[PDB]
Amino acid sequence: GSNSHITILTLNINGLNSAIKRHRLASWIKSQDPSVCCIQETHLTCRDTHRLKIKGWRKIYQANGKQKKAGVAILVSDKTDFKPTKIKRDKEGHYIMVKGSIQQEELTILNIYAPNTGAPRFIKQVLSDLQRDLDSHTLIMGDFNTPLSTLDRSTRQKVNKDTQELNSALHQADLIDIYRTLHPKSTEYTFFSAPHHTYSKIDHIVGSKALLSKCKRTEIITNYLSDHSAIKLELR
Ligand SMILES: O=S([O-])[O-]
């Protein structure tokens, strides 16, 4: 039935330098119809950001480096009135935060692409740097390049000390893994590693514990676009 929920989607797209990949992405976004879309690994340089244009999604905020490497973007649908108050872009293109409100209701979105190496330490550092901005209306999403619990890997291997430290930091900031909270017994994955034939959930949606009761539904979406599956959160 008709309602005022928003949907926030996160996808690591694995590059957007070829025109067709941009149209395939535009088609997929059009079909998913997210209020807000967090994309990682655009691989667009700070010179080439204007290449990313998606009909229906005219408001776009990007953080990019100088190389065809990393690159993150937050796209807001034309049907969504997100009045921003603050946009903080990583100079190296690994995260972007936008803060603002929809419907008089405040919302802080942090889109992160952690490096393959040192990911859990990287994410903890970003949280600390942004501590004053990450309030009780926060969603953090993206490709953390790490599991957060044992169920996030097919190996069932315990998570390392740096990941344990990351989880402590999340808890100190009143943040929780929304997907794992809604689906505690889930053994779904977003990424397949062919070298070891293993599967992992390295893409996450984390948020303020205060937003828990607003989190209606969250799901993983397989796709032909990328080597990562998307995740979608429906928020009251
Ligand atoms: O598109 S506006 O939010 O700068």
Break the chain into its structural domains and give their ranges.
1-236
Task: Please state the separation of Cα 59 from the chain's center in Å.
Answer: 17
Out of 2.30.40.10, 3.30.930.10, 3.40.640.10, 3.60.10.10, the CATH code matching 1-236 is 3.60.10.10
Residue located nearest, by CA, to atom 1 of ligand 1: 59
Write down the residue that tokens 């209701």 correspond to.
105
> Distances from the Cα of 196 to the Cαs of 163, 181, 199, in angstroms?
21, 28, 9
Residue located nearest, by CA, to atom 4 of ligand 1: 59
Contact 59 CB / ligand 1 (< 6 Å): yes
- Resolution at which this structure was determined, Å: 1.8
Characterize 196-207 residue by residue with b for buried, 16 or more Cβ atoms within 10 angstroms of its Cβ, and e for exposed: eeebbbbbbbbb
Contact 65 CB / ligand 1 (< 6 Å): no
Alpha-carbon gap, residue 235 to 121, rounded angstroms: 29
Parallel, antiparallel or unpaired: strands 83-89 and 59-63: unpaired
- Report the half-sphere exposure of 162 (CA within 13 A, side-chain side): 13
CB count within 10 Å of CB 135 equals: 15
Task: Please state the separation of Cα 165 from the chain's center in Å.
Answer: 20
